[PDB]
Write a protein that binds this ligand. Structure first.
Ligand SMILES: NC[C@@H]1O[C@H](O[C@H]2[C@@H](O)[C@H](O[C@@H]3[C@@H](O)[C@H](N)C[C@H](N)[C@H]3O[C@H]3O[C@H](CO)[C@@H](O)[C@H](O)[C@H]3N)O[C@@H]2CO)[C@H](N)[C@@H](O)[C@@H]1O
Ligand SMILES: NC[C@@H]1O[C@H](O[C@H]2[C@@H](O)[C@H](O[C@@H]3[C@@H](O)[C@H](N)C[C@H](N)[C@H]3O[C@H]3O[C@H](CO)[C@@H](O)[C@H](O)[C@H]3N)O[C@@H]2CO)[C@H](N)[C@@H](O)[C@@H]1O
Ligand SMILES: NC[C@@H]1O[C@H](O[C@H]2[C@@H](O)[C@H](O[C@@H]3[C@@H](O)[C@H](N)C[C@H](N)[C@H]3O[C@H]3O[C@H](CO)[C@@H](O)[C@H](O)[C@H]3N)O[C@@H]2CO)[C@H](N)[C@@H](O)[C@@H]1O
Ligand SMILES: NC[C@@H]1O[C@H](O[C@H]2[C@@H](O)[C@H](O[C@@H]3[C@@H](O)[C@H](N)C[C@H](N)[C@H]3O[C@H]3O[C@H](CO)[C@@H](O)[C@H](O)[C@H]3N)O[C@@H]2CO)[C@H](N)[C@@H](O)[C@@H]1O
Ligand SMILES: NC[C@@H]1O[C@H](O[C@H]2[C@@H](O)[C@H](O[C@@H]3[C@@H](O)[C@H](N)C[C@H](N)[C@H]3O[C@H]3O[C@H](CO)[C@@H](O)[C@H](O)[C@H]3N)O[C@@H]2CO)[C@H](N)[C@@H](O)[C@@H]1O
Ligand SMILES: NC[C@@H]1O[C@H](O[C@H]2[C@@H](O)[C@H](O[C@@H]3[C@@H](O)[C@H](N)C[C@H](N)[C@H]3O[C@H]3O[C@H](CO)[C@@H](O)[C@H](O)[C@H]3N)O[C@@H]2CO)[C@H](N)[C@@H](O)[C@@H]1O
Ligand SMILES: [Mg+2]
Ligand SMILES: [Mg+2]
Ligand SMILES: [Mg+2]
Ligand SMILES: [Mg+2]
Ligand SMILES: [Mg+2]
Ligand SMILES: [Mg+2]
Ligand SMILES: [Mg+2]
Ligand SMILES: [Mg+2]
Ligand SMILES: [Mg+2]
Ligand SMILES: [Mg+2]
Ligand SMILES: [Mg+2]
Ligand SMILES: [Mg+2]
Ligand SMILES: [Mg+2]
Ligand SMILES: [Mg+2]
Ligand SMILES: [Mg+2]
Ligand SMILES: [Mg+2]
Ligand SMILES: [Mg+2]
Ligand SMILES: [Mg+2]
Ligand SMILES: [Mg+2]
Ligand SMILES: [Mg+2]
Ligand SMILES: [Mg+2]
Ligand SMILES: [Mg+2]
Ligand SMILES: [Mg+2]
Ligand SMILES: [Mg+2]
Ligand SMILES: [Mg+2]
Ligand SMILES: [Mg+2]
Ligand SMILES: [Mg+2]
Ligand SMILES: [Mg+2]
Ligand SMILES: [Mg+2]
Ligand SMILES: [Mg+2]
Ligand SMILES: [Mg+2]
Ligand SMILES: [Mg+2]
Ligand SMILES: [Mg+2]
Ligand SMILES: [Mg+2]
Ligand SMILES: [Mg+2]
Ligand SMILES: [Mg+2]
Ligand SMILES: [Mg+2]
Ligand SMILES: [Mg+2]
Ligand SMILES: [Mg+2]
Ligand SMILES: [Mg+2]
Ligand SMILES: [Mg+2]
Ligand SMILES: [Mg+2]
Ligand SMILES: [Mg+2]
Ligand SMILES: [Mg+2]
Ligand SMILES: [Mg+2]
Ligand SMILES: [Mg+2]
Ligand SMILES: [Mg+2]
Ligand SMILES: [Mg+2]
Ligand SMILES: [Mg+2]
Ligand SMILES: [Mg+2]
Ligand SMILES: [Mg+2]
Ligand SMILES: [Mg+2]
Ligand SMILES: [Mg+2]
Ligand SMILES: [Mg+2]
Ligand SMILES: [Mg+2]
Ligand SMILES: [Mg+2]
Ligand SMILES: [Mg+2]
Ligand SMILES: [Mg+2]
Ligand SMILES: [Mg+2]
Ligand SMILES: [Mg+2]
Ligand SMILES: [Mg+2]
Ligand SMILES: [Mg+2]
Ligand SMILES: [Mg+2]
Ligand SMILES: [Mg+2]
Ligand SMILES: [Mg+2]
Ligand SMILES: [Mg+2]
Ligand SMILES: [Mg+2]
Ligand SMILES: [Mg+2]
Ligand SMILES: [Mg+2]
Ligand SMILES: [Mg+2]
Ligand SMILES: [Mg+2]
Ligand SMILES: [Mg+2]
Ligand SMILES: [Mg+2]
Ligand SMILES: [Mg+2]
Ligand SMILES: [Mg+2]
Ligand SMILES: [Mg+2]
Ligand SMILES: [Mg+2]
Ligand SMILES: [Mg+2]
Ligand SMILES: [Mg+2]
Ligand SMILES: [Mg+2]
Ligand SMILES: [Mg+2]
Ligand SMILES: [Mg+2]
Ligand SMILES: [Mg+2]
Ligand SMILES: [Mg+2]
Ligand SMILES: [Mg+2]
Ligand SMILES: [Mg+2]
Ligand SMILES: [Mg+2]
Ligand SMILES: [Mg+2]
Ligand SMILES: [Mg+2]
Ligand SMILES: [Mg+2]
Ligand SMILES: [Mg+2]
Ligand SMILES: [Mg+2]
Ligand SMILES: [Mg+2]
Ligand SMILES: [Mg+2]
Ligand SMILES: [Mg+2]
Ligand SMILES: [Mg+2]
Ligand SMILES: [Mg+2]
Ligand SMILES: [Mg+2]
Ligand SMILES: [Mg+2]
Ligand SMILES: [Mg+2]
Ligand SMILES: [Mg+2]
Ligand SMILES: [Mg+2]
Ligand SMILES: [Mg+2]
Ligand SMILES: [Mg+2]
Ligand SMILES: [Mg+2]
Ligand SMILES: [Mg+2]
Ligand SMILES: [Mg+2]
Ligand SMILES: [Mg+2]
Ligand SMILES: [Mg+2]
Ligand SMILES: [Mg+2]
Ligand SMILES: [Mg+2]
Ligand SMILES: [Mg+2]
Ligand SMILES: [Mg+2]
Ligand SMILES: [Mg+2]
Ligand SMILES: [Mg+2]
Ligand SMILES: [Mg+2]
Ligand SMILES: [Mg+2]
Ligand SMILES: [Mg+2]
Ligand SMILES: [Mg+2]
Ligand SMILES: [Mg+2]
Ligand SMILES: [Mg+2]
Ligand SMILES: [Mg+2]
Ligand SMILES: [Mg+2]
Ligand SMILES: [Mg+2]
Ligand SMILES: [Mg+2]
Ligand SMILES: [Mg+2]
Ligand SMILES: [Mg+2]
Ligand SMILES: [Mg+2]
Ligand SMILES: [Mg+2]
Ligand SMILES: [Mg+2]
Ligand SMILES: [Mg+2]
Ligand SMILES: [Mg+2]
Ligand SMILES: [Mg+2]
Ligand SMILES: [Mg+2]
Ligand SMILES: [Mg+2]
Ligand SMILES: [Mg+2]
Ligand SMILES: [Mg+2]
Ligand SMILES: [Mg+2]
Ligand SMILES: [Mg+2]
Ligand SMILES: [Mg+2]
Ligand SMILES: [Mg+2]
Ligand SMILES: [Mg+2]
Ligand SMILES: [Mg+2]
Ligand SMILES: [Mg+2]
Ligand SMILES: [Mg+2]
Ligand SMILES: [Mg+2]
Ligand SMILES: [Mg+2]
Ligand SMILES: [Mg+2]
Ligand SMILES: [Mg+2]
Ligand SMILES: [Mg+2]
Ligand SMILES: [Mg+2]
Ligand SMILES: [Mg+2]
Ligand SMILES: [Mg+2]
Ligand SMILES: [Mg+2]
Ligand SMILES: [Mg+2]
Ligand SMILES: [Mg+2]
Ligand SMILES: [Mg+2]
Ligand SMILES: [Mg+2]
Ligand SMILES: [Mg+2]
Ligand SMILES: [Mg+2]
Ligand SMILES: [Mg+2]
Ligand SMILES: [Mg+2]
Ligand SMILES: [Mg+2]
Ligand SMILES: [Mg+2]
Ligand SMILES: [Mg+2]
Ligand SMILES: [Mg+2]
Ligand SMILES: [Mg+2]
Ligand SMILES: [Mg+2]
Ligand SMILES: [Mg+2]
Ligand SMILES: [Mg+2]
Ligand SMILES: [Mg+2]
Ligand SMILES: [Mg+2]
Ligand SMILES: [Mg+2]
Ligand SMILES: [Mg+2]
Ligand SMILES: [Mg+2]
Ligand SMILES: [Mg+2]
Ligand SMILES: [Mg+2]
Ligand SMILES: [Zn+2]
Lengths: 50, 100, 87, 119, 60
RNA sequence: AAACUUUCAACAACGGAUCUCUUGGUUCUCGCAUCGAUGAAGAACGCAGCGAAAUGCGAUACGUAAUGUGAAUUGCAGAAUUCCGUGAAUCAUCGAAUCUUUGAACGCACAUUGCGCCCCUUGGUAUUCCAGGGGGCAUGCCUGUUUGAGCGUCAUUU
RNA sequence: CUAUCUAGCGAAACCACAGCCAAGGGAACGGGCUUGGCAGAAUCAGCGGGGAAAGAAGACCCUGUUGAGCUUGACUCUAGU
RNA sequence: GCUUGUGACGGCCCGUGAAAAUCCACAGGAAGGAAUAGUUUUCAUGCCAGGUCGUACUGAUAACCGCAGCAGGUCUCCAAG
RNA sequence: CGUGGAGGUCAGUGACGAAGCCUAGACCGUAAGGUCGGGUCGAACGGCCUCUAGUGCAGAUCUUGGUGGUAGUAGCAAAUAUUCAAAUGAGAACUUUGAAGACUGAAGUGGGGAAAGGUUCCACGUCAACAGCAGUUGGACGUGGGUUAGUCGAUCCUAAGAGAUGGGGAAGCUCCGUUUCAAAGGCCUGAAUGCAGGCCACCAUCGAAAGGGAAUCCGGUUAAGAUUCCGGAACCUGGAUAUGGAUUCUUCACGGUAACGUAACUGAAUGUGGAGACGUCGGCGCGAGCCCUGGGAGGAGUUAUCUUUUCUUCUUAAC
RNA sequence: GUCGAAUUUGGGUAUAGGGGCGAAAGACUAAUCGAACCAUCUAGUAGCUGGUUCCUGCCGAAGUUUCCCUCAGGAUAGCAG
RNA sequence: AUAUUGGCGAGAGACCGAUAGCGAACAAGUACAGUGAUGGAAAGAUGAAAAGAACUUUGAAAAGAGAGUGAAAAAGUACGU
RNA sequence: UUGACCUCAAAUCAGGUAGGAGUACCCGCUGAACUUAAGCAUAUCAAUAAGCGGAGGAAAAGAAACCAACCGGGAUUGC
């Protein structure tokens, strides 16, 4: 939030890196369930809570 | 029932005294060898107003008997005490306004 | 305007992240974590809270040490190396 | 590929020190080519090798420090029994063994008698 | 421009930048990228060419 | 008479009942006795040639060593496939290590990647100042040690 | 500016079954029962007579050996004193 | 003329209107102090270095709160004819 | 009569088709129900004798899940307003550009920040979903790029306030307390480091991105960062410190009546003084920027007619 | 309505559920206040509403007696299988 | 000798059969809600095997129509019945 | 003057130990009300729930200041 505490920039940095679509190749794997990333996030929809 | 207003005051909280801008506490000089036997001299350096107190305070310097330093005291000005006057303090001290 | 208008005023956070438990339960003004209890010595738990318990108990975590203790007990807490087959 | 555990154990410390440094040189240079190419699976074996080199160098110095303390009463807590908190404060086989002089004679005067009953 | 240990201050950078690539480092400015990795802007003094030493490390 | 509506059939929709599946749950029994200041439980952030999870791990980071095993791993790639071999492997086993930032959590803090002090060592003229590296400084208590305090107190003074 | 008509988008209330009357008797004010009036597809804009319309297990009232806020020389206690 | 800063002042109170870090100064006279020399680093000039975290963008009839791209709510600076 | 399971038995049925399901098809039973054909189906299932229950639904404003009529209906009408053409595209009332018409009218629909969000910023790709019409556009989707400081903040200080410590309560989780009924230390010097000097000593710490406070400016630069980068010019703290200059034979400066002046001009313990450092209102003087404005030197608009015209450039940083 | 003060307001900070806080409305204490929100005791008790799942065959009632802090409930006798 | 809804390792049942059985047979104490304590889901089944529909054709495209695979497409990742 | 003693301190003195987690069972402390009584106060719920301190693999109890009153019996625990 503007001038931000490091811990929160760090916590931010995390959730940024883990918002991605599934890698396409995860769905070729033998015995594979996952079709899509079900934990995907968005700034408009769900808020992080710091 | 509820807890009536006059009970809530002993818990402090809202009802504590508003002390910020006050001068120090108004206290005499400590009772020591000086005042108990002879007297002592000090200048009332300024009188001045103490917040929430309607009785002006007089700030009296003294010289430390047992060390070389200045020691300031906070006295309640006695009506006719005045900046620059010499306050005398002790059993041997004279009988005059401002003296203890 | 006890409703929608008064909601627009909420920018301050009663709690930030609790160093110990990682929730946002750490009361900024109270300087005590709501969920975990930091910085009390003990960790917060209640018997009427049995669901809260099974959220935080052992094995909900990584067990980084404890998990291996059983194998190490299974055989004698072995000192030393392994002798191979040799010839 | 890369390094091997037994081969390293023969080489001297000061060689291992240099072993590392040119592995770091390589692994570093790997990460350069790595981003100019459609991946680079090769870099795995060198960063694993660095672990092995560093495991051995550790094995030596720990064993060496193990020697310097051999036989002494007080050894670094690093190198001690481990086992269990509760365990390692249990009485020693010696301490549990002790018996009052009154009893050691009673444990001699009339110690348990093996017997049987026929017919 | 180098990715750097998040644990490495501007001294450690300059010392290790000199030691590894054998160059004089004028000044060092470090930020932390959005992803949580430190980026260092390491300026080489006039005595060297940064593009040379760049593809002396083999990127160009 | 159409349209429309209603009822029935057929096919098509809608929806997921029913049937059959079951690496799950549930309950009974049997055996065993091992968490932590040697840093646990739990947390945070990281770690893969290409991963967001789950799982595993800790800058030696889906693992390093040891032991067994005897050729795979497999989504594509890659390899050295280093196969009569100290040797494949997301294998089994585990006795050796590593183990970031934490946490009873230990120099002090902690909505801060904030701030002191000691020791060793390296570089910048360098006992002092700056910097890199390495190891350090919590509490109560016990036993011991060394150093102290008290006209509480016995001797010696000379 | 709506409403209205159109393209596109597209909810909710409510719903035993339903929906024309007069009288009769009837739980003493019927859409249905009985006797009469009658009775012709499919519909649009309006309307506020009815649907004892919708909204919410009536708050009034009584009942309950059901409460709670409150008061007091009710019953029984109690911190302080 | 507008905004704004400063100089000199007048009035108001049974209201008389923060603290600490920090910095310079004075009184004092402990002390060191020269001749073929010893003095001063509050005068000039010259040498080297300064770590760590934050730094994007919205700040609102769309980027915060109010289930939402909600006619609501949310502190402040600049201000032309 | 019927359902899940259990012992026994038909050496029961079945991939040549079990179970289920669908049948305005058949038969049996008063009935619960039973049986058969046909279709669809894919791996199990039934008769009799017994055992056993989480054993039969239409309702409970029942539970969960799914679906209707209402109904292409209520609606999609606040915030003055749109129009022509091109480009792009399979596709344009909605995208881009041009033109025209307008609005907010600086107490703004302008230019920045605080809390808060957390990549929304920027660029390329791109339209299934979302943007209650649309979408070639997007704060969406996909892939990447991006936030550089000794001087701006934090960090330091203390505020209300919070909080360890000797301690005293409380069965205890814990309570009180912040200088208190405590043996509460950490500086500068010499002799490379201990003893001898010696002063001084009521007192952890947390608590302000609007309070206090060491110190930077202009110009240029990106798709996206800048008081941070680049170019130039500075300053502050911290070290080192040499030369110049100053002072002394009257050792620790000279001058002025004095207010005070000078490039410097020794100063321990200790004491003290000052700046930090502060309310509110009212006018009055002065400055800066803005406003208005003349000459002149450029550029621009209008010019049937009129206007020595209307608009616009003429700037100056901290140090 | 008020608009230079009992003015409006940011942030920091303090008071917590029989408690707080209240220029007093039982007001406010996170859309919650004549006792907050969360979990547990708890499947709280209910003489009171509501519901209570297959078929056939035979028999077949009571609203009365007495007692009851009994009158919407029981005990009791009667009717019934 | 006795206790044992925990820990570790086992063997079982006239138990439950995806609205059942633990809340969770699944990236389940997860997604999500709340300032907070806490609250807390949904969701198993193509086929023996992807053989996951080459190719032609209409279409801006999503797709349709041929045509192929297969025991079956009356199994086409909207997948057993 | 010098040497012990008692008491009481300090040290980053030399060696250690306590904390926290778990909590089905176990030893204690503390401690309800819903509820039943067809009302309700004792009583009941219950020496229970919640709260607190301490363990082990079991804990605890135990070799009798016991039980009995018998011709006596003989640590404790459990059925
Ligand atoms: N309660 C605050 C009290 O302030 C007192 O302090 C008094 C003074 O020491 C202090 O004076 C400050 C001075 O410290 C500071 N360094 C300079 C400042 N100008 C002075 O301020 C004071 O004097 C000036 C001039 O007379 C006035 O304009 C101003 O209103 C006044 N507060 O201000 C106070 C008088 O107003 C004492 N420290 C003590 O009694 C107490 O802390
Ligand atoms: N966001 C922090 C807090 O999370 C709380 O809830 C969190 C928990 O339920 C859960 O967090 C668990 C945590 O319980 C458990 N003890 C450890 C575990 N690793 C955490 O996991 C979480 O963290 C990861 C990593 O950032 C995230 O991907 C994700 O939020 C979640 N899986 O994830 C939730 C994330 O919101 C509350 N919602 C709230 O107090 C606050 O938002
Ligand atoms: N001082 C207590 C002793 O600390 C010892 O531990 C020593 C180290 O192992 C320990 O190091 C910690 C480490 O645990 C941790 N995981 C990483 C951390 N940076 C280190 O921290 C150490 O240095 C940092 C420097 O910033 C200090 O801030 C910190 O106070 C200090 N403990 O810190 C101690 C030295 O300061 C032992 N654990 C033990 O004997 C005892 O607890
Ligand atoms: N005070 C001396 C004079 O101050 C004048 O300026 C002063 C005034 O403008 C103004 O002073 C006002 C005064 O006007 C008015 N009549 C009285 C008021 N108390 C003063 O205020 C002053 O004193 C109060 C303490 O009383 C402080 O708290 C306050 O900060 C200070 N400004 O504040 C300035 C500083 O005191 C001029 N500088 C000059 O005429 C002269 O120096
Ligand atoms: N806004 C900035 C101002 O611009 C002004 O700029 C004016 C001058 O530069 C210049 O003045 C010229 C004059 O030199 C020349 N001899 C003739 C010319 N017509 C004048 O211009 C004139 O413009 C119009 C007349 O059309 C008048 O309204 C205006 O007052 C007058 N200056 O034309 C400008 C018109 O305003 C002034 N320089 C000065 O006030 C200031 O810089
Ligand atoms: N059209 C040529 C290619 O078809 C490919 O797709 C092939 C199939 O995957 C696709 O199958 C579709 C299916 O997607 C969709 N859900 C509908 C239907 N089940 C299938 O339909 C297909 O099979 C049926 C049966 O024989 C044919 O009659 C029909 O023509 C054909 N399109 O039909 C295509 C064959 O005609 C790819 N889409 C692409 O490579 C390209 O479009
Ligand atoms: Mg899944
Ligand atoms: Mg969340
Ligand atoms: Mg009360
Ligand atoms: Mg006070
Ligand atoms: Mg809300
Ligand atoms: Mg805030
Ligand atoms: Mg608060
Ligand atoms: Mg408190
Ligand atoms: Mg702590
Ligand atoms: Mg459990
Ligand atoms: Mg488990
Ligand atoms: Mg498990
Ligand atoms: Mg490990
Ligand atoms: Mg920085
Ligand atoms: Mg990046
Ligand atoms: Mg009809
Ligand atoms: Mg099957
Ligand atoms: Mg691999
Ligand atoms: Mg890549
Ligand atoms: Mg993980
Ligand atoms: Mg994996
Ligand atoms: Mg392969
Ligand atoms: Mg292959
Ligand atoms: Mg393995
Ligand atoms: Mg291992
Ligand atoms: Mg560790
Ligand atoms: Mg740590
Ligand atoms: Mg710490
Ligand atoms: Mg160090
Ligand atoms: Mg200790
Ligand atoms: Mg209408
Ligand atoms: Mg229409
Ligand atoms: Mg609507
Ligand atoms: Mg609704
Ligand atoms: Mg309605
Ligand atoms: Mg009706
Ligand atoms: Mg009539
Ligand atoms: Mg009638
Ligand atoms: Mg009538
Ligand atoms: Mg009628
Ligand atoms: Mg009716
Ligand atoms: Mg009819
Ligand atoms: Mg009839
Ligand atoms: Mg009729
Ligand atoms: Mg009639
Ligand atoms: Mg009507
Ligand atoms: Mg109606
Ligand atoms: Mg209503
Ligand atoms: Mg209503
Ligand atoms: Mg009612
Ligand atoms: Mg009601
Ligand atoms: Mg009412
Ligand atoms: Mg009544
Ligand atoms: Mg009654
Ligand atoms: Mg009552
Ligand atoms: Mg004017
Ligand atoms: Mg005041
Ligand atoms: Mg001064
Ligand atoms: Mg002087
Ligand atoms: Mg910036
Ligand atoms: Mg910015
Ligand atoms: Mg703005
Ligand atoms: Mg809005
Ligand atoms: Mg929002
Ligand atoms: Mg408005
Ligand atoms: Mg608004
Ligand atoms: Mg406002
Ligand atoms: Mg049966
Ligand atoms: Mg059953
Ligand atoms: Mg059977
Ligand atoms: Mg059978
Ligand atoms: Mg057969
Ligand atoms: Mg069947
Ligand atoms: Mg039929
Ligand atoms: Mg058939
Ligand atoms: Mg069919
Ligand atoms: Mg069949
Ligand atoms: Mg099958
Ligand atoms: Mg089969
Ligand atoms: Mg049957
Ligand atoms: Mg049932
Ligand atoms: Mg049913
Ligand atoms: Mg039904
Ligand atoms: Mg029904
Ligand atoms: Mg509907
Ligand atoms: Mg209809
Ligand atoms: Mg439509
Ligand atoms: Mg319409
Ligand atoms: Mg309307
Ligand atoms: Mg409008
Ligand atoms: Mg057009
Ligand atoms: Mg065109
Ligand atoms: Mg438009
Ligand atoms: Mg346009
Ligand atoms: Mg206008
Ligand atoms: Mg303004
Ligand atoms: Mg406004
Ligand atoms: Mg901006
Ligand atoms: Mg954008
Ligand atoms: Mg959208
Ligand atoms: Mg739309
Ligand atoms: Mg569309
Ligand atoms: Mg994007
Ligand atoms: Mg600054
Ligand atoms: Mg501070
Ligand atoms: Mg204080
Ligand atoms: Mg305290
Ligand atoms: Mg005291
Ligand atoms: Mg010493
Ligand atoms: Mg500040
Ligand atoms: Mg910008
Ligand atoms: Mg520059
Ligand atoms: Mg003024
Ligand atoms: Mg300046
Ligand atoms: Mg009025
Ligand atoms: Mg007025
Ligand atoms: Mg206020
Ligand atoms: Mg309570
Ligand atoms: Mg009460
Ligand atoms: Mg109280
Ligand atoms: Mg008020
Ligand atoms: Mg009232
Ligand atoms: Mg609410
Ligand atoms: Mg409320
Ligand atoms: Mg109300
Ligand atoms: Mg009430
Ligand atoms: Mg509440
Ligand atoms: Mg709530
Ligand atoms: Mg019940
Ligand atoms: Mg109960
Ligand atoms: Mg009952
Ligand atoms: Mg009744
Ligand atoms: Mg009676
Ligand atoms: Mg009734
Ligand atoms: Mg009877
Ligand atoms: Mg009979
Ligand atoms: Mg059990
Ligand atoms: Mg349990
Ligand atoms: Mg095994
Ligand atoms: Mg068995
Ligand atoms: Mg299912
Ligand atoms: Mg389920
Ligand atoms: Mg289902
Ligand atoms: Mg079911
Ligand atoms: Mg069942
Ligand atoms: Mg469930
Ligand atoms: Mg999910
Ligand atoms: Mg909740
Ligand atoms: Mg299925
Ligand atoms: Mg399968
Ligand atoms: Mg084509
Ligand atoms: Mg195209
Ligand atoms: Mg075909
Ligand atoms: Mg063929
Ligand atoms: Mg095919
Ligand atoms: Mg074929
Ligand atoms: Mg066949
Ligand atoms: Mg088939
Ligand atoms: Mg099929
Ligand atoms: Mg397919
Ligand atoms: Mg599909
Ligand atoms: Mg379907
Ligand atoms: Mg199907
Ligand atoms: Mg199947
Ligand atoms: Mg020690
Ligand atoms: Mg404990
Ligand atoms: Mg316990
Ligand atoms: Mg009762
Ligand atoms: Mg009762
Ligand atoms: Mg009662
Ligand atoms: Mg009792
Ligand atoms: Mg209990
Ligand atoms: Mg144990
Ligand atoms: Mg046992
Ligand atoms: Mg025992
Ligand atoms: Mg005895
Ligand atoms: Mg016995
Ligand atoms: Zn916590």
């Amino acid at each position: 939030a503007a001038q931000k505490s490091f811990r929160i920039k760090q916590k931010m940095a995390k959730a940024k890196k883990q918002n991605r679509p599934l890698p396409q190749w995860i769905r070729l794997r033998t015995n594979n369930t996952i079709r899509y990333n079900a934990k995907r996030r968005n700034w408009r929809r769900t808020k992080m809570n710091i | 029932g509820r807890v009536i207003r006059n009970q809530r005051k002993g818990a402090g909280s809202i009802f504590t005294s508003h002390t910020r801008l006050r001068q120090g506490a108004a206290k005499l000089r400590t009772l020591d060898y000086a005042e108990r036997h002879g007297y002592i001299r000090g200048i009332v350096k300024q009188i001045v107003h103490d917040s929430g107190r309607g009785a002006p305070l007089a700030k009296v310097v003294f010289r430390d008997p047992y060390k070389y330093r200045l020691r300031e005291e906070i006295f309640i000005a006695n009506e006719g005490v005045h900046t620059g006057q010499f306050i005398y303090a002790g059993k041997k001290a004279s009988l005059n306004v401002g003296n203890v | 305007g006890k409703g929608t208008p008064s909601f627009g005023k909420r920018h301050n956070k009663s709690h930030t992240l609790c160093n110990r438990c990682g929730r946002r339960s750490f009361h900024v003004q109270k300087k005590t974590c709501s969920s975990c209890g930091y910085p009390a010595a003990k960790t917060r738990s209640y018997n009427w809270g049995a669901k809260a318990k099974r959220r935080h108990t052992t094995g909900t975590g990584r067990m980084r040490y404890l998990k291996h203790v059983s194998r190490r007990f299974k055989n004698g807490f072995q000192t030393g190396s392994a002798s191979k087959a040799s010839a | 590929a890369g390094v091997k555990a037994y081969e390293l154990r023969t080489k001297s410390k000061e060689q291992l020190a240099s072993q590392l440094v040119d592995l770091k040189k390589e692994l570093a240079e790997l990460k350069v080519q790595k981003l100019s190419r459609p991946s680079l699976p090769k870099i795995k074996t060198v960063r694993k090798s660095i672990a092995c080199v560093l495991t051995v160098i550790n094995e030596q110095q720990r064993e060496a420090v193990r020697q310097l303390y051999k036989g002494k009463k007080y050894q670094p807590k690093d190198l001690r029994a481990k086992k269990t908190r509760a365990l390692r404060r249990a009485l020693t086989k010696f301490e549990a063994s002790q018996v009052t002089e009154k009893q050691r004679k009673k444990q001699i005067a009339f110690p348990q008698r093996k017997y049987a009953i026929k017919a | 421009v180098f990715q750097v240990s998040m644990k490495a201050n501007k001294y450690q950078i300059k010392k290790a930048v000199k030691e590894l690539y054998e160059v004089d480092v004028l000044k060092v400015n470090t930020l932390v990228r959005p992803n949580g990795t430190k980026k260092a802007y390491v300026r080489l003094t006039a005595d060297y060419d940064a593009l040379d030493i760049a593809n002396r490390i083999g990127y160009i």
